[PDB]
Amino acid sequence: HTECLSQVQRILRERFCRQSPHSNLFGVQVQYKHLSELLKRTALHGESNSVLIIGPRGSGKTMLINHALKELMEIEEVSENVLQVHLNGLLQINDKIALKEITRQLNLENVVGDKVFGSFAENLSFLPVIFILDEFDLFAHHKNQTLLYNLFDISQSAQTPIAVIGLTCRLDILELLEKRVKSRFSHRQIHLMNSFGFPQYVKIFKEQLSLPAEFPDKVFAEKWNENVQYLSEDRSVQEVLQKHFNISKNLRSLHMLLMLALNRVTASHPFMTAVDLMEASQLCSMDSKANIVHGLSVLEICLIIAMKHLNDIYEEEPFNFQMVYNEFQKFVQRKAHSVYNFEKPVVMKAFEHLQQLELIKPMERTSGNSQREYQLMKLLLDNTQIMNALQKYPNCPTDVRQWATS
Amino acid sequence: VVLCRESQVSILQSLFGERHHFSFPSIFIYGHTASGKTYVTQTLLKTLELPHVFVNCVECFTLRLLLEQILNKLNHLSEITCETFNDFVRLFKQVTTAENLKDQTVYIVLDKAEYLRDMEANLLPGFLRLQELADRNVTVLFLSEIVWEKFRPNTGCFEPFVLYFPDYSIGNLQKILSHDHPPEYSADFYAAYINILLGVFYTVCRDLKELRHLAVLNFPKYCEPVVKGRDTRKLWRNIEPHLKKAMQTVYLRELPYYSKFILIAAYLASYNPARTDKRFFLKHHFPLDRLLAILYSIVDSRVAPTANIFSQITSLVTLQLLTLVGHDDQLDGPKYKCTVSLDFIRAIARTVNFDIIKYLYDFL
Amino acid sequence: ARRCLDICRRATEICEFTIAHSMEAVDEMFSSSYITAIKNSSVLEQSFLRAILAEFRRSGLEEATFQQIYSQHVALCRMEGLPYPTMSETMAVCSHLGSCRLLLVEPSRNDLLLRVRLNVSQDDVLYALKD
Ligand SMILES: Nc1ncnc2c1ncn2[C@@H]1O[C@H](COP(=O)(O)OP(=O)(O)OP(O)(O)=S)[C@@H](O)[C@H]1O
Ligand SMILES: Nc1ncnc2c1ncn2[C@@H]1O[C@H](COP(=O)(O)OP(=O)(O)OP(O)(O)=S)[C@@H](O)[C@H]1O
Ligand SMILES: [Mg+2]
Ligand SMILES: [Mg+2]
């Protein structure tokens, strides 16, 4: 009952939100085999290696390394001799901070010293330890690439064994390095691509939402497995999966969609429904621009229609406040006695609000020399977007609609 | 309390689950100005009694201030000073180990996040993936008016769950305005007040705060006729002109002699092309010298070039009526621009007994 | 000599698994991976690349705004019968492509007025997309 639902909620939330390790690996057999073999070579012997892993973000780059480490560290007492250092390109933006982190993680600050002294020969002269480098591309943007060069040098040196592992999303990581480090860099690359078809994606979806064999209740788990198996071949679920697979093959989006779908699982509905997945897919695939336009007022809509007319008459040219005001006045004067008698300041405030919402952006920004008036503005919307948004407007008056059509 | 806000609250409560449960690393909430983002989330956090730290981006205009305020408030919930983001991560890991903070999710509410993209390059990506780095059951919320499309960094980062707060309608606005009725009169009286106010001003002013402010300001005049002695027609007839006068201002809430001539000459120099200048001033057929010549032509009396006229010029420059264009060091070829509205210049010319329209080349 | 030694080591590694070993080492540690990355791309990304190529052929310029590219993509989707794509989906695909340095763009602030430049030669794209 309720306790089982709470436990399965916890397990699935841990699986998706935190990305807890799982024994299931998809289409990464050769890559993981190669990486684990090389890690075993670097650990059981004094040989050194340098490898880069290139892939799109969210493609489980970190999972390979984590699984390999959990697989190979516990083999023997080698874990006692092996030391691990982790460096992230986001936290360490300067070489001084990187050196401080390296010293602190190695617990040599007592040996090296506590003060801010720039000398690092204490470690360099003293320098098996493995290095992990997340966001390797950021390190290449340093002033002289000193840390990367020193790491490659000690890797190529014959003093101590050092294994270097880098992670990258850019495919051009080779050209961001200088000639010296590139020559000293062992050209070992692993590529992580989602090289699998739509049926394999469906199998991945079916397996991911499958309860593990360690759950206490067994008949409930079997019923859950049968339910997910049945939901696998439903054509609405397959349509949603086809849409998301066409959009992107990254597993992170799939995990997010599954989490959002599972959010709507309650006691009254212990097992999911295809309509729930349809609702989640609809919630994940709505455009913000149309919503923002829908949330506007009448005066803003009139101003936007005038802006569209200006863009149509003058093909791809900027504009200012005065022309828009003049043609809005023309529109309200052609009509006999419509209730739109507004003065300059209120229209000016409406224009300021529109610019604040960042639907309009200035060109070659300057202030003081040019006022808000007489400033070259441009629109950041498309005609079809305006038409579609105006169709769904709740209480659009007839006059403004016909003016928009004209 | 919250009115017409039940879907989003239910969604958030379902998302949170239990205290020991985990949640998303990043939720990005966006909506309009008067959607009530601050009210709803703060009331929900107070009701659920969760450990949350509320932060304004504008107040913390520097990274050190932001981190120190976050750490101090979190410690008070359970002096600390940090300087770098890595040090902040380490100190956060150290401080989160409290028993009250052991198996509970920590929430960091940030509002007015539009400025975060102008603070540092890597600060936003670091905040997005905080739960991975800390690994300590941490959730970060965002409140903003700009869509997520413009918050995306070039390198791409962990995509937050996007959420939208629905826009308000006539019924919702009327209900919200009619909830806080004054106790000294009937509820239906205030409901009719809100109805007529909406019928007058909903075309332009949809802001809940602004409309409520207008209602608060105008209610005393609404209640006068009954005090003077449920007459709908009487009240409407007595009250209409005041409402029209109020609607005249929805969002709004004597120069020396020679200064007027200087201003009109500057306006003429700015808005009249040079080629026509003689056509308007030479008896027979912008730089400072042009202004001086135009001033000498306009004024019927011979004006001596006393230093006081230059003092007037500089004073007008200071008063932000004339804008200096060229370099400040170059005070032999200075350039000026006039920023006065045309109605103002027409009024001052009328007070001077001068017809500027006869000289404006564009109008002719 | 360094890369020669690396090739010899990799050939020994492969032989552990002839001239074929050395050929595999040299063409794996020197050749570029752009073609296979393009080949393993998604269908929508392929349509986007085809739209970019068509717009470039129509114009002849190496820089194109995001609006014309979007229009060509919509036309190609209509020709292919694919469902109508939203602007947000196209921008997300563009950002994903730009993340791996296949294109060149600054989408942080500009959205509809983004200059797009190909990071690889056009003939390589043609040879990758013909298959
Ligand atoms: N081959 C795979 N087998 C199993 N799970 C996978 C595989 N590829 C990706 N995943 C899952 O995809 C999810 C998202 O991967 P992430 O770990 O967020 O990406 P990443 O490895 O951190 O790469 P970055 O660039 O550091 S964000 C995780 O839950 C992984 O378990
Ligand atoms: N749904 C609502 N129910 C009840 N009162 C509301 C509601 N929405 C807004 N209010 C009231 O309106 C006041 C002003 O709204 P805000 O909370 O300032 O709107 P906001 O979305 O937070 O915009 P910002 O971020 O402050 S510019 C709040 O303090 C509430 O008293
Ligand atoms: Mg990672
Ligand atoms: Mg607020």
Curated annotation (Swiss-Prot), chain A:
The keyword DNA-binding applies. GO terms for cellular component: chromosome, telomeric region; cytosol; nuclear origin of replication recognition complex; nucleolus; nucleoplasm; nucleus; origin recognition complex. Its main location: nucleus. Component of the origin recognition complex (ORC) that binds origins of replication. DNA-binding is ATP-dependent. The specific DNA sequences that define origins of replication have not been identified yet. ORC is required to assemble the pre-replication complex necessary to initiate DNA replication. Binds histone H3 and H4 trimethylation marks H3K9me3, H3K27me3 and H4K20me3. Component of ORC, a complex composed of at least 6 subunits: ORC1, ORC2, ORC3, ORC4, ORC5 and ORC6. ORC is regulated in a cell-cycle dependent manner. It is sequentially assembled at the exit from anaphase of mitosis and disassembled as cells enter S phase. Interacts with DBF4. Interacts with POLQ. Belongs to the ORC4 family. This is Origin recognition complex subunit 4. It comes from Homo sapiens (Human).
Curated annotation (Swiss-Prot), chain B:
InterPro entries: AAA_16 (IPR041664), ORC5 (IPR020796), ORC5_C (IPR047088), ORC5_lid (IPR048866), P-loop_NTPase (IPR027417). Keywords: ATP-binding, Chromosome, DNA replication, Nucleotide-binding, Nucleus, Ubl conjugation. It comes from the Eukaryota. Belongs to the ORC5 family. This is Origin recognition complex subunit 5. It comes from Homo sapiens (Human). GO terms for molecular function: ATP binding; DNA replication origin binding; nucleotide binding. The keyword Cytoplasm does not apply. Abundant in spleen, ovary, prostate, testis, and colon mucosa. PANTHER family: ORIGIN RECOGNITION COMPLEX SUBUNIT 5 (PTHR12705:SF0). It is found in: Nucleus; Chromosome. ATP binds at G31, H32, T33, A34, S35, G36, K37, T38. Component of ORC, a complex composed of at least 6 subunits: ORC1, ORC2, ORC3, ORC4, ORC5 and ORC6. ORC is regulated in a cell-cycle dependent manner. It is sequentially assembled at the exit from anaphase of mitosis and disassembled as cells enter S phase.
Curated annotation (Swiss-Prot), chain C:
It comes from the Eukaryota. ATP binds at R2. Transmembrane segments: none annotated. Phosphorylated during mitosis. It is found in: Nucleus. It is linked to Meier-Gorlin syndrome 1: A syndrome characterized by bilateral microtia, aplasia/hypoplasia of the patellae, and severe intrauterine and postnatal growth retardation with short stature and poor weight gain. Additional clinical findings include anomalies of cranial sutures, microcephaly, apparently low-set and simple ears, microstomia, full lips, highly arched or cleft palate, micrognathia, genitourinary tract anomalies, and various skeletal anomalies. Component of the origin recognition complex (ORC) that binds origins of replication. DNA-binding is ATP-dependent. The DNA sequences that define origins of replication have not been identified yet. ORC is required to assemble the pre-replication complex necessary to initiate DNA replication. Component of ORC, a complex composed of at least 6 subunits: ORC1, ORC2, ORC3, ORC4, ORC5 and ORC6. ORC is regulated in a cell-cycle dependent manner. It is sequentially assembled at the exit from anaphase of mitosis and disassembled as cells enter S phase. Interacts with CDC6 and KAT7/HBO1. Interacts with LRWD1 predominantly during the G1 phase and with less affinity during mitosis, when phosphorylated. Belongs to the ORC1 family. The BAH domain mediates binding to dimethylated histone H4 'Lys-20' (H4K20me2), which is enriched at replication origins. This is Origin recognition complex subunit 1. The lineage of its organism: Eukaryota, Metazoa, Chordata, Craniata, Vertebrata.
